[PDB]
Design a protein around this ligand. Sequence first.
Ligand SMILES: [K+]
Ligand SMILES: [K+]
Lengths: 355, 355, 355, 355
Amino acid sequence: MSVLPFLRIYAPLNAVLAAPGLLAVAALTIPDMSGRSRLALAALLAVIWGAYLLQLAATLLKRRAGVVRDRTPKIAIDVLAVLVPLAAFLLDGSPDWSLYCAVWLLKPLRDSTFFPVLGRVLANEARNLIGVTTLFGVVLFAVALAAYVIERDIQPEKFGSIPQAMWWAVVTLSTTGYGDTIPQSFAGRVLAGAVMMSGIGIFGLWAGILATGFYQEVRRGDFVRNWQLVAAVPLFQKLGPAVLVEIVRALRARTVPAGAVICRIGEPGDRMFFVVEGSVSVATPNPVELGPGAFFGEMALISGEPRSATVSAATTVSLLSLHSADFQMLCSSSPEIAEIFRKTALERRGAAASA
Amino acid sequence: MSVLPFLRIYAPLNAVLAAPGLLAVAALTIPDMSGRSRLALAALLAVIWGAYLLQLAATLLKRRAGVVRDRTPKIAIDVLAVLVPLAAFLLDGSPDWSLYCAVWLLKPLRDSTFFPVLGRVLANEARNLIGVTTLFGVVLFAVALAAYVIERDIQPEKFGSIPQAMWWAVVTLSTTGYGDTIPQSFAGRVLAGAVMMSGIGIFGLWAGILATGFYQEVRRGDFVRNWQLVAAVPLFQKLGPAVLVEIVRALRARTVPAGAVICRIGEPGDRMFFVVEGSVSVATPNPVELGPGAFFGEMALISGEPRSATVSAATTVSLLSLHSADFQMLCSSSPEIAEIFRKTALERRGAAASA
Amino acid sequence: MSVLPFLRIYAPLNAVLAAPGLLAVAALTIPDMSGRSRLALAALLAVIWGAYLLQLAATLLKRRAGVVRDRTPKIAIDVLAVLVPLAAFLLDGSPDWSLYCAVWLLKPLRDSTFFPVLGRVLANEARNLIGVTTLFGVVLFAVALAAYVIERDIQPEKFGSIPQAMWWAVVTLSTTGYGDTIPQSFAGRVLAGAVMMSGIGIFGLWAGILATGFYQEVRRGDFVRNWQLVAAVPLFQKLGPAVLVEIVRALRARTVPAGAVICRIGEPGDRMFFVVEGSVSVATPNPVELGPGAFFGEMALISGEPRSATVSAATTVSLLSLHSADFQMLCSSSPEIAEIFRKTALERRGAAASA
Amino acid sequence: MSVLPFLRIYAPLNAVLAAPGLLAVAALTIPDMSGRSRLALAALLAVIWGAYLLQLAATLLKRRAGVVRDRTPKIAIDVLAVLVPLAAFLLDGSPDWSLYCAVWLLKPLRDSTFFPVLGRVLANEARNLIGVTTLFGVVLFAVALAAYVIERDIQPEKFGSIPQAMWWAVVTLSTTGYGDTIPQSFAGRVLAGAVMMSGIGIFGLWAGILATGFYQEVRRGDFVRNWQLVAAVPLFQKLGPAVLVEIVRALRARTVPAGAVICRIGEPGDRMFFVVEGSVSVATPNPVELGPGAFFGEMALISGEPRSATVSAATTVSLLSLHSADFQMLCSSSPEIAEIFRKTALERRGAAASA
Ligand SMILES: [K+]
Ligand SMILES: [K+]
């Protein structure tokens, strides 16, 4: 609610082309298709092939920024990006070679930031996952067997075995309800009463395990990435040691592209930012274009009012952001700093129209 | 648990009439219907048409309160509120013109406060949503394909393609279980074992993303709306800077209409309020009708007892509210203020029966 | 994890008999039943009828503890507990009179503490619920209509109307998958892709609303019920104002019945309690039976060891409880109090075997 | 995200063999199976029988570490581990004796740490569970009956009774959708509208109850297990009383086996550890193998850089771990301690290459 994320966060065309590229699979897969567009899209694979392949050798030129890097991951597919289709072209002379369109599916995961963020925490908590997972396996065959107890007589063809009941186990326990083979008798129907009650407690915990400290990591991700952009501010020599830990939980940084709007005039004032790199378009009669290491909105927070400038991104600005309360926290945290935001709440009233 | 929300929070008849209005759709949609009430309700559209249309021009008189306003949203439908049915009346000479009863469906969302509260936070966290959404797309075709591997031989008509398996993908992954086309073999049935385990982890995270900082916003909404109603209290010059940030998390403000009851006598005392605007009905032999900037319940909290007055809303009062602990926090937070709540715990014992 | 709840929390036989009582419904409901046990259980209604009716008049003697009470709730069913069956006996001369066995179903909710705890918070947050509920209604007909767009031609009999699609709406959106009427075409099948994605976000929020501050109330319930049992401890005159608010979040109180076990000897020491009312069975050669306002386990916490006594409930003790950390919080919170728990960690070593 | 869990957390072969052992069930359960491998796996039971039985008597030698122990749990199955199959071998002369392969299913739960962690908290909160559980039973028959109201006429064979509707109750309320017997009329179909809305609120709370303080316990489990490994550090005499309670929430301890890698050189520096027992492989020209009571990474945190050593586990090290922020918390928490981490940030620069 307090951040301006822009400048094509879904930027690189590498990540893009799997989306169109894989949809070209389908028409090959389907009878009653004229051969015209059958192969027209086979090129389009050869395009993205050629295109990543065009990208490829430039990537293998890893002499750019070659100081200290661990690029086993980013290359791990680029290799197979182009070979697996290729040998597929020959040894699978039949059209099925296209079925190696499962292969690009890591290309998003090549440049998927937020995926290593996933895998990072699985390696702390999987202790639980297993003890749950086993326990999921506990409750499975604990219960799956209890049907084999019963309907083997009148439902051999459906419940004449164990795994056929393990089939009906997780279909039942995992909230689903397919609806192919269901009991008939009383007691076998009784047993269901704890099942949903159970499984929704199980995943009641287990999927809960995921978000549990995942959010910590993401709520940590916004710190670790933002103990940066701290000392840049010329004013933060006087902030206290413990003061920051409160703050930076909320402060998210994002970039804005050139030309974009930052805050429009006349809209109600709700938030202030800290500029740390770039330049702005403070639309006043004399544009107060503030450079790296600036801020604005105290005019809008201390008074509780609409905006004093249609501020727009003159350049690609790496922005911070902060709503009122946690700025009221700051002005409450120290009378030292509210002095200059009191002064600046008078200076920028005339510095805006003047130079 | 600590708030008195009243005075028709679902107030305006603009938001209302879509509810009855759209149900008039149905009878047109149905064979074997006499033409009598077929058209009787077509008027009822023409009513709400005429009614919003009656409202309309008065809304286009935006010379009321015309100081600084951004009403592109609120008008955005009022325009189409009345035209879209109208041109529909002619060009769609057939009865299908009523099918533009999808159009009013934003009229609730016209005056739906709490909906911009939704959209505010989507523009901070959608970075995640996409990386999840892609990742949802990752796992989809990662898995959907694995059925095309198998049942193309004996289930052409069901699993003779890719998208037919992508159909069975999200039906399966999204907790559902339609129950039309299900595998037969072993290994194809094996693959399900991670699916529900997966998707309930996925939405285990993803829908979790929604409530995650949404609650922050709503838990923030109760601050931002309530850094107001602070300085009104004549006693809050001595409260500390950091003191407030703790408090206002809990303090919710709501309005009560005239005539309503606020706290009934004899019921156990559990909460105290801060009056800031309006007047009350403190039912005593001499009603101590306290105006803006008042409170009551310390008689009920410091002793731990039932109520001393059937306090009722003599007028439309904008109320605050506060349970004990966080008032015990306050009396614990400072011996300065408990003095006057000690005194007031004696004054109001006799001021209640006296004047 | 830190509480000993015992003494028949599901105590009163009033709440009990609905459970057996209502199961007597069934056999009446079923063809091919001999008349023998048909009516044998009709008495059993007449029993619980007579039994609550026996209870009844004693309840109408509300001259016990008649100081200040609001018993409109508790009586609200006892009235209808016995009349509704009665007039049902005559006017419904046919056996269907038993179908007023929906009536006792509030009798649990008569003495269901934890149910008013539910209703308390619905009256704060229903502002959201409605704006969601409407929004649920928004998305419903927003989408339900989109099927009427399509399959009216080849599925008149299933999708030849609006509500038949609203039927398939919430079946689909609410995670279910009945599996009666499903589309056939492409685009109508496309639309599902956001649905589960949506509804699991919707209830992703909405059911989240319930637990959201519900837990606050229950986490508050353990305070409000436990600002009691504070001043009873003779040692809590020196605890700081803010000190308590941290603590009492964790401290839950429960009662134990006479004869029961409290902590068994030899088991690892993990928790200590504060006795405030009753007496114990500290099994030592000289039983140190401590009365109201006592504690034990510092021998087990300061050393990090197993138990020094098979302490058992000599009487009905209202207990508190506290694990280590939050007691380590206390010994960390003040060197003042650890002195006497240092001394008591020597006194009780010999006071246990001595008198 | 901040822990290195290794050394076969799924270690003991006791817990293992149920997994293979129980899968041998299946082939016995299936017609059209040659008798060859029918019995080959019956030995494999006799193996694990013999194997646990081999383990058994060594376990009954509970003269190892026999100081104070409560091993009623761990033995509780080892008894039945071997008898229940045995008497099953004779009295169940028919092959069904194998159906006592439900019996080992506690053997994982024998050595399942994290399962007593489950049961610990159920004995605090089941007060709620019941009041919910009853309330689940409230809403069940509250609603299940409402179908018997209706479809008894035209659906005797499906809805000609109560429990047949209670069948359709929880199938419906518990998010499932089997899809066998569904209404036809209007009003009976209306009633569903609150059901999913309800049940997802119910489990909206109820399964929420599980994770609610479960996470407290697990977030407590990482304290209680880690008030240990505190005084071992020679430097923690000066840390404040309240200082620790913040810290140890985050500090998780895990063990690493000999030979494993701890932090690889060149990777970006993100975390530091506290060694408390064992030895390391700090790969430098002169390996600075630090023993119990050591740490490393301040070189990587104070500068914000990659790693200075491919530190690898020379021995089985019981490790702690700590990311930056909470170490920035520490260096912020006291200028006293940052002095020696300033000095050590110079000493280890040359102590690494020197001895
Ligand atoms: K389902
Ligand atoms: K189904």
